Design a protein around this ligand. Sequence first.
Ligand SMILES: *[C@@H]1O[C@H](CO[C@H]2O[C@@H](C)[C@@H](O)[C@@H](O)[C@@H]2O)[C@@H](O[C@@H]2O[C@H](CO)[C@@H](O)[C@H](O)[C@H]2NC(C)=O)[C@H](O)[C@H]1NC(C)=O
Ligand SMILES: *[C@@H]1O[C@H](CO[C@H]2O[C@@H](C)[C@@H](O)[C@@H](O)[C@@H]2O)[C@@H](O[C@@H]2O[C@H](CO)[C@@H](O)[C@H](O)[C@H]2NC(C)=O)[C@H](O)[C@H]1NC(C)=O
Ligand SMILES: *[C@@H]1O[C@H](CO[C@H]2O[C@@H](C)[C@@H](O)[C@@H](O)[C@@H]2O)[C@@H](O[C@@H]2O[C@H](CO)[C@@H](O)[C@H](O)[C@H]2NC(C)=O)[C@H](O)[C@H]1NC(C)=O
Ligand SMILES: *[C@@H]1O[C@H](CO)[C@@H](O)[C@H](O)[C@H]1NC(C)=O
Ligand SMILES: *[C@@H]1O[C@H](CO)[C@@H](O)[C@H](O)[C@H]1NC(C)=O
Ligand SMILES: *[C@@H]1O[C@H](CO)[C@@H](O)[C@H](O)[C@H]1NC(C)=O
Ligand SMILES: [Cl-]
Ligand SMILES: [Cl-]
Ligand SMILES: [Cl-]
Ligand SMILES: [Cl-]
Ligand SMILES: [Cl-]
Ligand SMILES: [Cl-]
Ligand SMILES: [Cl-]
Ligand SMILES: [Cl-]
Ligand SMILES: [Cl-]
Ligand SMILES: [K+]
Ligand SMILES: [K+]
Ligand SMILES: [K+]
Ligand SMILES: [K+]
Ligand SMILES: [K+]
Ligand SMILES: [K+]
Lengths: 263, 263, 263
Amino acid sequence: KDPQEILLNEAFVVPYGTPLSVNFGPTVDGDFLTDMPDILLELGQFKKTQILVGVNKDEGTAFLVYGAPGFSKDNNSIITRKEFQEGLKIFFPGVSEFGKESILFHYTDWVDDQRPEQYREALGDVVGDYNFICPALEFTKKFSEWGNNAFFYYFEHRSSKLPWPEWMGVMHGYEIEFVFGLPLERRDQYTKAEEILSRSIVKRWANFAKYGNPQETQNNSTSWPVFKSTEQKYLTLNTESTRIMTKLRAQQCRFWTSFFPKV
Amino acid sequence: KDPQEILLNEAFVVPYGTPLSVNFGPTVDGDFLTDMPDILLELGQFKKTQILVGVNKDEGTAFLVYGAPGFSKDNNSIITRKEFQEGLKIFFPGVSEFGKESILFHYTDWVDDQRPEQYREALGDVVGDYNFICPALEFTKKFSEWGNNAFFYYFEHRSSKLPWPEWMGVMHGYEIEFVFGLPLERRDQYTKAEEILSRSIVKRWANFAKYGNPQETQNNSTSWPVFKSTEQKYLTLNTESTRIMTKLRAQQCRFWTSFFPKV
Amino acid sequence: KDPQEILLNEAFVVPYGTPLSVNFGPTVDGDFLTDMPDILLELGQFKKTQILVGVNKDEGTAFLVYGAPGFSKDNNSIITRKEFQEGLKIFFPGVSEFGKESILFHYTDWVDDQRPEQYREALGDVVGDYNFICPALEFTKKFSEWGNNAFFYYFEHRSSKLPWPEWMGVMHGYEIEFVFGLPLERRDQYTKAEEILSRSIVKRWANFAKYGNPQETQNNSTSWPVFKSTEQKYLTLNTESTRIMTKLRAQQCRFWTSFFPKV
Ligand SMILES: *[C@@H]1O[C@H](CO[C@H]2O[C@@H](C)[C@@H](O)[C@@H](O)[C@@H]2O)[C@@H](O[C@@H]2O[C@H](CO)[C@@H](O)[C@H](O)[C@H]2NC(C)=O)[C@H](O)[C@H]1NC(C)=O
Ligand SMILES: *[C@@H]1O[C@H](CO[C@H]2O[C@@H](C)[C@@H](O)[C@@H](O)[C@@H]2O)[C@@H](O[C@@H]2O[C@H](CO)[C@@H](O)[C@H](O)[C@H]2NC(C)=O)[C@H](O)[C@H]1NC(C)=O
Ligand SMILES: *[C@@H]1O[C@H](CO[C@H]2O[C@@H](C)[C@@H](O)[C@@H](O)[C@@H]2O)[C@@H](O[C@@H]2O[C@H](CO)[C@@H](O)[C@H](O)[C@H]2NC(C)=O)[C@H](O)[C@H]1NC(C)=O
Ligand SMILES: *[C@@H]1O[C@H](CO)[C@@H](O)[C@H](O)[C@H]1NC(C)=O
Ligand SMILES: *[C@@H]1O[C@H](CO)[C@@H](O)[C@H](O)[C@H]1NC(C)=O
Ligand SMILES: *[C@@H]1O[C@H](CO)[C@@H](O)[C@H](O)[C@H]1NC(C)=O
Ligand SMILES: [Cl-]
Ligand SMILES: [Cl-]
Ligand SMILES: [Cl-]
Ligand SMILES: [Cl-]
Ligand SMILES: [Cl-]
Ligand SMILES: [Cl-]
Ligand SMILES: [Cl-]
Ligand SMILES: [Cl-]
Ligand SMILES: [Cl-]
Ligand SMILES: [K+]
Ligand SMILES: [K+]
Ligand SMILES: [K+]
Ligand SMILES: [K+]
Ligand SMILES: [K+]
Ligand SMILES: [K+]
């Protein structure tokens, strides 16, 4: 077959896709991957070395405009309860009714004003916590239980040049340009504070690669503590103040990690 | 003398007052107070029991409009470096030039954009950290070193009905109405979220008085951990999310507590 | 160029030198030195082995007669406050006025008699603590935090044959002849007690090189304890009594190490 014909048909090999559909991805091949990876991770079979792991504040939002009803990059995407329910259908196509109600339940006990943005925000969190944040935090706990140093960050700066709308917040993919040092180029219309954040991140990544320890040691910076099961400290990355915090998304991940998999 | 004549002359018994002038306050009388209290605190001579201690996010701002030049409750109070320097004169009347430059130094290493509000914000912090926040945190460390449980909070909600302007933030005195439960009165034009914050605070204060432990135990609330020297955990009080944080104002209080007193 | 012409011009490559001017010294070349060394030290990138580190009691004095006003090797160098201030100019040429006042402040709170030698002594200490003693003690703490044994000494014997005057005390460079065993030569007009001190030092250095442990094990000598962050024990070297002491120059080094670098 010519390549186009393979590509054109890729989208349909699946009965129903989601916006995060991975039609063709990694498998347990007996070669690159000798067993189910959940089992390797659990039983400590992996390279012993240091890791640096992190997530952005609004991982799930990018995906809502590729299919969830009531969403648009061109308006404020205030959605109703019903639209929320329909969005869960779109993101959780093979899940029992009870599976879906349980998500609705975990994410809609409002605190508390009847804010119009309640449902729009809950859907972004749902998508981001299940698909990105809770699996990242779970890999870091399990990896670190076998003795190696790990460091965990939570990126909460929204690029001043972001072409997406405000409601989508600190989006998935939009730390990359900080890590690669784009805002160090003064000609580029990023702010002074963005220049400084990128410089500090670039230093911490570089020190991690060279020395295994993602510190910025010269400019009175906050020390990045190791992530240990038990305390679960992480470092926030932002323009205002860098903070040491504990137990990211603790209630949400208990839901995704210990209950949802049974469903 | 008639009372008016005593009152009229109270303001002048002092060569130069500040907006926080306490012309007539507590003294070491040999009776109520048997020694200099700094010495009692240091050497562990005080009632052994539990304490609950806290501060508001912008303690110092209320005072800037009673004398600092360039300030007004009726505009945004953008001040220059020079006006800052003059404000230090107003707040630190008996202090050497070097004493004042040292404050300027600690508080004006900008991060970093040349934001117009830099000087206005630094002056509020200066006034609040010296007069309220660092002495509160220091009393709590010293008290807790002798064995008793202590709990520390940082109140960061600005009342929706605050008649003062926005720049003044979470002002000194404006937690009181939350503690006394004014926003529980639905007729009063506070928001739903304010109602819930006040209800939770009132419960925590009440449980502290009855049981010595300022927990809200029924509504999946964040546990308030004891404040210990070493970890120095505190609880944030706000409408969005309640957090456990460590070492409030650590760099600023090291300045006020260990250096400024020598000056 | 002929060598003389390079040498003649070396002194002027610098806008203003101090008596400790190092016009041409080590650099981060990418070769011998792969990164800024403060960063290597902080992050534990160095040979892991034992170290022996120390300083003399009056490191800074030798330098005062190469430029500080009011100093002379031929008189008692009683200087005034003003001369002190001028000496700080000579030793701290690129430092802000505030930087200089802060030194004056740390070093001139007299205890307390108005002794005429107050200013002369404070200037020697200033020069010695900043340039030699606090950096030595800081390298030893940081080195030892990564697990290796370290030993720290404070040499306080003034050679009986010292051609410099008395006020200059236990000068920089004048332990060397003890380490190399010059006073073991009985023909040389050093005292009996100096002979014994040199013999003990030579033994301790030799045992350190051979065995990693700078003990003198045969003559009922004081054991030299390892220097650990936390306790910070050191050994004094003198003719009368050898002592174990803690936290050399603790108040002065807190000044040089944690505050002065910001200035
Ligand atoms: C925000 O936009 C969405 C997205 O759909 C629309 O895109 C808009 C920018 C709009 O101008 C229109 O061209 C396009 O249909 C709106 O969702 C749509 O809602 C309308 C109701 O009139 C329905 O016809 C559609 O079913 C629905 N489309 C999808 C894909 O869900 C949404 O109402 C709007 N919300 C606002 C302004 O809050
Ligand atoms: C904000 O207001 C201050 C306060 O002083 C003024 O109050 C204003 C609301 C104003 O309308 C006027 O009635 C009153 O004087 C301003 O500070 C003043 O600045 C002016 C410069 O024109 C000086 O004349 C005064 O010295 C000074 N007063 C004091 C007490 O400091 C300030 O300039 C203004 N700032 C803004 C708009 O950013
Ligand atoms: C100690 O000596 C200094 C050094 O300067 C002088 O050296 C002396 C030994 C002296 O005999 C003279 O030959 C030479 O000038 C004295 O400092 C000098 O003070 C004089 C005041 O008469 C000034 O003329 C100089 O500015 C100053 N020189 C320098 C280089 O600073 C100092 O007064 C003297 N102190 C004593 C005796 O306590
Ligand atoms: C450290 O120093 C200055 C700010 O005072 C700045 O130019 C530089 O970017 C900082 N370095 C890092 C790695 O953040
Ligand atoms: C607990 O329960 C409900 C919210 O579900 C609320 O009415 C009440 O105020 C809460 N109680 C406290 C003490 O916060
Ligand atoms: C030990 O013994 C004698 C003194 O009793 C002396 O001659 C010798 O120098 C001492 N040795 C050392 C290494 O100090
Ligand atoms: Cl329903
Ligand atoms: Cl490790
Ligand atoms: Cl915690
Ligand atoms: Cl200035
Ligand atoms: Cl108790
Ligand atoms: Cl911490
Ligand atoms: Cl003076
Ligand atoms: Cl060792
Ligand atoms: Cl001690
Ligand atoms: K968040
Ligand atoms: K459930
Ligand atoms: K704050
Ligand atoms: K200072
Ligand atoms: K000494
Ligand atoms: K200082």
